[model samples]
Target: VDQATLDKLEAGFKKLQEASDCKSLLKKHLTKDVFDSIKNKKTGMGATLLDVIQSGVENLDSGVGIYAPDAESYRTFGPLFDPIIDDYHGGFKLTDKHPPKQWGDINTLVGLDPAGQFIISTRVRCGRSLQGYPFNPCLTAEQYKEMEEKVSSTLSSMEDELKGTYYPLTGMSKATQQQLIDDHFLFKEGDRFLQTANACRYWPTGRGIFHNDAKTFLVWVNEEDHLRIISMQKGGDLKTVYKRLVTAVDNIESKLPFSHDDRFGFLTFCPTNLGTTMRASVHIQLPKLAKDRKVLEDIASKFNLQVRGGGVYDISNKRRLGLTEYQAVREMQDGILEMIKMEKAAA
Candidate 1:
């Protein structure tokens, strides 16, 4: 690399290393050669390595803190994600094993609440990218609308609980949209992180939501990724929630081709969701566990779980690269069960 480019890489690397939010576990692996390969690299629409890491720098401490503007961007910026994945996924090389395809059934899963009291709700959502489309940053306005129409058509054909109406943001009433967001039934808008990365272009043109009548199942079309299929509900029926998500993903995969590779099981805008892209979480009322956030965090981390604010935490598999969606959920289920037991004992 030239002097200016070398200087840029060094500066960026310094910022990343110093930032408390930076979770790139493979800091040691980031060498001059890695930076040289993609320095000033730009795709068709000016997507760059800087765009991928800007949020990670700006919002240090962000979970899975980086994104890939496009498939090409991932290759160029692969070094950035290599360590993050290694850290979250227990040091599995991409060539070691492929991601899981069968997201197990409800019978195989145990609910978080056998007694039915601790958890307030359960949610498991994952992101997906279309096979041919570029990531958000490079998408044209027309591409966004087209993606919405295609996804909506596919989802509307569902037979049972997965069936739902697709609501396009184009003419959506502000009140309705706000209500959905407020209830956490839909994706939030105007995320400044996405705005700076040029992922929110054309506003809501290509965006919409599809949710079942019960609202237990939902999908955000053309959001952060091409599709964010979600399944959630009140109480601690994690099995049912997970089943819904697995079924939805399977059914959708039948109609649409998702972007995938030998390395990344399922491709997405954000590197964090690259594998199974699954985030199985529950909202619980842990009065005792809430007292010492650090203590709770430490315990949760042991099970590969993330303890977010408001008792909203997700199961982050210690071996995600080798673990299946069902395995991850099981880990969350066990972790929550243990947590509830601890909470009750503290009472």
Candidate 2:
């Protein structure tokens, strides 16, 4: 390597070495042995080991600590990406292929808070990438404009409840955008991980949001992924929310192809969202369980779910890779059912 490249590596190495308490998967797995094996290699897209780990390297407090600048980055730097993927995705093995997608039965799912008192809202969302484009880091400026046009048009044509307006970030006012963010209907700025990964390139060129009249169905273009399809609503009518998502995804899939792999099911920039790419979560008020956030935490982890926030808890399924779409949603459903029981027990 040239002196510049060598110097850069040393700088990064020193940073990692000093961050003893950082819990990112990159820190946990990227020992000197692994770093040497990967230092000079580059992917077909010219992505290097530094491109892959820069996110975690820069954001030492990161949880997962790696990103695939392109799909092939996974193969080119398997020694680096696989460990982070495996640990974050519930011990998914290097040899373990994600099972084929199966939506299973939507009728099988009911609401988490049928009585209307314990739950504030419901959400089920997933990431998707257009078939022809690479992930964000490799995209040219023109490509970003092209993808945003295609996504906005394709989504605007949706009928019935799926029809919505597209709001590009290019000219949106701060007050209006901030209002949406405050309502939790829009995404904020990129975090340390995304910023360092170079995923925020081209700024808001290809980025925008779409939502139906009722704000129940939504899609984010060129955010963390090329597309983040979401279906959510006030109250806990989960079946309705999930059904809308399934329909929206199908409608969009018919118009625009999403990137997918035989092994990963759905391909995303991050392995943690790879398999089904779905996250089924809810905001529920569990006063009793929330007494000791640890108690809710215990119940959540036991059911393969994660809980966040207080007063009204934010809970969702944890494992997105190595599973079917329906199976992932079912994880959250069952865990919430248990949580409701516990809440009533302590009442």
Best by TM-score: 2
Question: lDDT per residue, candidate 2, 208-267, as tens digits?
Answer: 899898888888888888999989988888788888999888888998998887766787
Write one digit per residue (lDDT tens) for candidate 1, span 196-274.
6678889879888888988899888877899988899988888888888888888998989988867767888876566
lDDT of 2: 0.82
Taking all chains together, each candidate's TM-score versus the true structure is 0.79, 0.88
**In order, what lDDT does every prediction score?**
0.73, 0.82
Say which candidate scores most in lDDT.
2
TM-score of predicted model 1? 0.79
Give model 1 RMSD, 1 decimal.
4.5
- Candidate 1's C-alpha runs over 4 A off are 1-32, 40-66, 87-98, 186-188, 288-302, 309-320, 342-347
